[model samples]
Target: ASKGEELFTGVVPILVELDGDVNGHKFSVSGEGEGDATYGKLTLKFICTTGKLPVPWPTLVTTLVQCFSRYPDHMKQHDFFKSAMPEGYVQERTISFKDDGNYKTRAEVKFEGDTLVNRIELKGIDFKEDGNILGHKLEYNYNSHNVYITADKQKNGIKANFKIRHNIEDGSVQLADHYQQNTPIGDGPVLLPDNHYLSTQSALSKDPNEKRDHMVLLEFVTAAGITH
Candidate 1:
């Protein structure tokens, strides 16, 4: 009953209470976490009913269990999308994948405190990404396809391995080398470099091995996104 992929959609009603004396000061602590999975928040409070022996403050340590992380399924649009985030306390990522042979991506997630209180976009809904050599702000583009591959052997396999370097206003994108061929893609299996909207298709001889032509068609699609 406890082994699965979607155990948490983020919300975990949390409340912990404790009471004791510290340096002759009778104190109690109350901890709470609440809200929707995406806009959830945490809080803590200490109440000292009897004190004054000397306020020698000491650090309070606590350990919380199974604090849920990660968004469930698709991108979510939340009300606090543009809320101020503490410096260096934010995270974002782009994930492009396949669904029924088509491409889908969720990018620019502004996550704070394990909350998906940010933008919601799924599929190739947003193709704008990167900068300069591969900026998200696409003023223009050149896309279309014309390429072929032919071979004369049964044990032949091919793979396209490469790397893409995109510029950023911050640090850098340490893009790893892409080793491809989930039979290739309609537009990407890799972060398409710059204004290059590309695709891949293949044709195999129907009658196996009887001296016929088999081919691969590499197509390109042209388009760009501009910020409004």
Candidate 2:
């Protein structure tokens, strides 16, 4: 029942009609099979086409079906479905060292409004069979549409800084990178792709394409007797 990524093109014709909206984006699903048996559950397929930015569709749909399906009536109250953050809100997440029973680097993330800050501390790391003592610290921030990153490896005497600014209004991004020595390594403004939301938003709104082609294939079968 797993169609996999092969269903992207027209090689498999999707017959079933399944459509839904997620985070303002429109998606259509098609699949086959239904039952209480091992292979009886429906295997759904979904796709996103020019509504808004697309997220991981398969995982998103599966989470909705498995988790949100239980509280269909009260789904609007969930944080995941909330459209915007409350004013003056602050949220934080942290991963302590060895929390996973390993020498994992410590990391923390703080979210305040549209700004997100991340910090990571590396005690050490293994590289090419060499256990290097890396007393490194990295900090990054995403403010509105801009990003800032700074990394410092005190033990190795290495430091780097990078910044990126995203212009959603014009669909352009500016990037700059440099080392602690102050010699600029890279800097430039790059345009977004044609299919990207910022690049296609105005054009699609003025001249909508109604003839876009979207095809999918759905085949239903009983997995009751099959054993892995």
Candidate 3:
């Protein structure tokens, strides 16, 4: 999809799985966002298995949207969910815009990888009420981090906490994982939440064909409270 704030209302759940020995990757995703109420609920899920065996894969999830259906202006956004996937498996996604116009999302998945990192970014794109692009880009790299904690399958619930770093032009991003700054937090029975502060030089592509690094960081966070 094209870059802009209009694309930020829907909930998009992305899961990246890495394999150590296969040089392969697997992805599971789901998205749910609110739109006009009459638009109904929008949900998506998929699995992609690429590369050889023993590959270290990374599953990513970002909290940006509130529902899962394609908006009237961005109907293709839904098609991206249906036609653009590796196939197999089920997933869930969700997003919501905060009072500050920033958003957050959550995804639940079981990926195969020794280490899974969760990264998030808040982009400040201008949007029209009908979801049209204004041709203005005020995006900035905010925050991101690697995750290394076991998810609490029973309590606390697995939720991706996305905090707004910059209220104005420069928005902040966050991430969750086990390893940070080359430091090992060690593995435990409970999943510990991790967040990262991203630099302007650390931008990522929303998709493979994306030419510029204009997409926001999509971090994945999982627990038991999230429903599929």
Candidate 4:
């Protein structure tokens, strides 16, 4: 395999334990009214405390959707977002568009990346688990929203801070660990809590507290079962 910058750029997030600390990349847009006037933007902070790991595009997608599920239109905005971004992960200069029909907006929209080639990013192409955990050396046990993930339990002392349990009844997601308040989801998969933000950091200021939950749309869709 011959080597060249073009052949290896943007290959993947972090492939090795020590190579995980990647520099954070930001995607942003601004208005032209003043010196760098701002409109809106978002940052991608890969979970890399020990070593930065590539955020699985789906898990990242799920995280963003779960964070904004309370909106009037969930996922579609995510659809708009993933589609709006450039095909690659590299960041570039601001992209501008004409103000049309007095309907002003700076989504910052023909949903440019709509073609099959452009749509390739969201086509279930690169969903993957990072290199941090060794599945063959690890195992898990759980109940409801509580999870116990251990690695080499019989010969090791490792308990990961990140834990997850698959709720077969509702596709429910929660954040907790040994010592976390066990709310026991009970038999009502439909009765999800509003404060289950577990790890969702609120975007609001002290003006008022905020929480993010993804259920209830389905109940309003029929009692509790979110899907698209």
Count of backbone clashes for each model?
10, 5, 62, 6
| Residue runs of model 1 more than 4 Å from their true location after superposition | 1-7, 35-58, 61-66, 69-228
Model 4 lDDT at residue 174: 26
Show the lowest summed lDDT stretch of 10 residues, model 4.
Answer: 214-223
Indicate whether candidate 1 or candidate 2 has the larger TM-score: 1
The weakest ten consecutive residues by lDDT in model 1 span 57-66
Clashing pairs in 1: 105-123, 129-136, 130-135, 131-134, 131-135, 143-221, 143-222, 144-220, 145-219, 145-220
Arranged by lDDT, best first: 3, 1, 2, 4
Which one is best on lDDT? 3
Tens digits of per-residue lDDT for model 2, 1-228: 111111111221112233333323345433322211121122233233454323222111111110001112222222110111111111111212221111122222222332222222222122112111011111111222111112122221112222323122234332222112111111221111111000000000111333332222121222111122
TM-score, structure 4 vs. true: 0.16
- Each prediction's whole-model lDDT (CA): 0.23, 0.20, 0.25, 0.19
lDDT score for residue 59 of model 3: 20
Model 2: how far residue 78 lies from native, Å: 27
Better of 3 and 4 by TM-score: 3
lDDT of 4 by residue, 75-182 (tens): 222111122222221111111111100101111111123211111011111111332121111112223222122222232111212333322223433222222111
Candidate 3, residues 1-228, lDDT tens digits: the string is 322223334333333322211111222222221222124232222122332211111222232222222223423322221221222112222222222121122222221232112222222222233221121222333343322222223432223223223212334322122121111122222212222122111233345663432233422221112122
lDDT of 3 at 29: 26
Instruction: Between candidates 2 and 4, name the one with more favorable TM-score.
Output: 2
Candidate that scores best on TM-score: 3
Q: List the residue pairs that clash in candidate 4.
A: 20-52, 218-221, 218-222, 219-222, 219-223, 219-224
What TM-score, computed on C-alpha atoms, does each candidate reach? 0.21, 0.18, 0.26, 0.16
